[PDB]
């Protein structure tokens, strides 16, 4: 019936099974549905048949989360290019719908949505992580409190979901710190080209160089007036992630939580993929705009006992950071300041 495509039949032929088997076989059906109108219709046909719709949709999403027999290797740090959203990523973007059709699953949509975003962010698929972020409706953080004040949730505030809402807020702050960098980088590469000097030019060609340079003076003034603004925004977003509140970015707060070692390993890995990378981006943003003393204050941020970012770099990356810190330290000396950017008195 799955292989002629189920309309109205399988649900009744599935409630004649124990719940473990009924859930598993109706999930094994819904794992084949890509047609959005048929998704809704074939959930209501299960809700007309006393089936466990909630463990069914969780089983569809978790089986699709589990189809990657891929361990988190450390060689794939490599500069892969153009790793955009494939059909095998879309079958994991177009799976969160199963927990969004019914409001009673917004918690699970966020718990599983985080797990698929953890995969895509580690896989450098930042747009695919943003496609999953857009599958989670923006009311969901309030709806998880609505579903706790009327009657009750897995606990009077769940220790899975307080940590999951905190993790979704970490993921949003990381996507803000990527989108603002992507637009800063698009804009930084747009730089107005200075009008070339013609050798031995006529009077007409000199006026037709003035009437190029006196446009470059405007174009470059506008372009820097946008660059310094984008350099403030991306710097808010990279500080919001590197200095993220108490516990810090992709760290929990509820020690009354249940163990997930898949989640905990992925979060401890993502802190080591993302936070060193953001520090190398932020140094490059500050240094390429001439903000050379803020490039050095990254050392106090990385060594800070509040955020302990020195625990998420390799020794080789702390050497790379001490090498980049010295790039700005030399540009301050070539500006006539001290090695840390202060006034030299004489």
């Amino acid at each position: 019936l799955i292989r002629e495509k189920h309309t109205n039949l399988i649900a009744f032929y599935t409630c004649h099974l124990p719940q473990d088997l009924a859930v598993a076989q109706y999930a094994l059906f819904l794992e084949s549905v890509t047609e959005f109108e048929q998704r809704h219709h074939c959930l209501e046909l299960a809700k007309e048949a006393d089936l466990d719709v909630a463990t069914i949709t969780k089983t569809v999403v978790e089986n699709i989360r589990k189809k990657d027999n891929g361990e988190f290797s450390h060689h794939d740090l490599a500069p892969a290019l153009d790793t955009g959203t494939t059909e095998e990523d879309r079958l994991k973007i177009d799976v969160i719908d199963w927990l969004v059709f019914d409001p009673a699953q917004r918690a699970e949509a966020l718990k599983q949505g985080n797990a698929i975003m953890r995969k895509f962010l580690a896989s450098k698929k930042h747009e695919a992580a943003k496609e999953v972020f857009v599958k989670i409706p923006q009311d969901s953080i309030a709806e998880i409190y609505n579903q706790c004040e009327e009657q009750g949730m897995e606990s009077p505030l769940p220790a899975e979901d307080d940590n999951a809402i905190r993790e979704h807020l970490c993921i949003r702050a990381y996507l803000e710190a990527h989108e603002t960098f992507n637009e800063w980088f698009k804009h930084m590469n747009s730089v107005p080209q200075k009008p070339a000097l013609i050798p031995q030019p006529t009077f007409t060609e000199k006026v037709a160089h003035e009437h190029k340079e006196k446009k470059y003076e405007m174009d470059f003034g506008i372009w820097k007036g946008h660059l310094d603004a984008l350099t403030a925004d991306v710097k808010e977003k990279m500080y919001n992630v590197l200095l993220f509140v108490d516990g810090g970015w992709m760290v929990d707060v509820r020690e009354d939580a249940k163990e997930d070692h898949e989640r905990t390993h992925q979060m401890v890995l993502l802190r080591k993929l993302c936070l060193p990378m953001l520090c190398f981006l932020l140094h490059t943003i500050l240094h390429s705009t001439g903000q050379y003393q803020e490039c050095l204050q990254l050392a106090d941020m990385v060594s800070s006992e509040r955020h302990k970012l020195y625990l998420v770099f390799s020794k080789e990356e702390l050497r790379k950071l001490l090498q980049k810190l010295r790039e700005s330290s030399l540009m301050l000396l070539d500006q006539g300041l001290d090695p840390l950017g202060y006034e030299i008195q004489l």
Partner: protein
């Protein structure tokens, strides 16, 4: 322009180091460039001890010294020694880092451009009139800063301790209530009682750590409170309650 001092050939580094022994504020940049990171730790720590002109520069020198010690092949014992020797100077500088943004604004001070301050100077800021939000955390810092004063300052630590406690008692409103109310219940919102409750939680003997109730009442700093018999009673009742509560 000096970047050129460091980009010299390795075959001259055994001359360069034996000349940078006359300029410590550049020697660490050649020590790191030689991977002699065990020197760079100590050079940047010496420079951090000498850098009093800029608070944010002393912090960056310790941040670089600590990132040399977290990159050198020190043994696990010497590495814990040089983590802890630096962690106490981070704890000291955290008292200057955590100065209230209103106290900094009212004194027109900038953390990026102000000098390093000594413990009596940090105490003197925290307890001042301009700290118009001073609380049981700032009046805890102002007592904990008494443990960062050397035996060669011409400064009686006990008279600082008296003046800190007097200025806590002058932030607390020792006016009388509407005649229905217990002064050992009402005192529990006072910052003076909240620092006693901190010292008790944090393990300290109030029977040995506090000045005498005779002489906290003979200190002149209290001014207008030194004529208030409700303050005279409530101070004694809370000293009696919190010191007898430890016997």
């Amino acid at each position: 322009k000096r970047g050129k001092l460091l980009s010299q050939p390795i075959s001259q580094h055994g001359q360069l180091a034996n000349f940078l022994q006359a300029h410590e504020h550049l020697s660490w940049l050649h020590e790191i460039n030689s991977q002699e990171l065990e020197k760079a730790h100590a050079t940047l720590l010496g420079l951090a001890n000498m850098e009093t002109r800029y608070f944010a520069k002393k912090k960056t020198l310790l941040g670089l010294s600590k990132l040399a010690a977290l990159a050198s092949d020190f043994s696990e014992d010497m590495l814990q020694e040089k983590i802890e020797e630096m962690a106490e100077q981070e704890r000291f500088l955290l008292h200057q880092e955590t100065l209230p943004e209103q106290l900094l604004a009212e004194k027109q001070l900038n953390l990026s451009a102000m000098p390093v301050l000594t413990a009596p100077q940090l105490i003197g800021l925290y307890i001042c009139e301009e700290n118009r939000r001073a609380n049981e955390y700032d009046f805890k810092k102002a007592l904990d800063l008494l443990e960062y004063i050397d035996e060669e300052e011409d400064i009686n630590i006990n008279d600082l301790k008296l003046e800190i406690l007097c200025k806590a008692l002058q932030r607390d409103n020792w006016s009388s209530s509407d005649g229905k109310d217990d002064p050992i219940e009402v005192s529990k919102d006072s910052i003076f009682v909240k620092i006693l409750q901190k010292l008790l939680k944090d393990g300290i003997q109030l029977s040995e750590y506090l000045p005498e109730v005779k002489d906290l009442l003979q200190a002149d700093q209290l001014g207008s409170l030194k004529s208030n018999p409700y303050f005279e009673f409530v101070l004694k009742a809370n000293y009696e309650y919190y010191v007898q509560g430890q016997i």
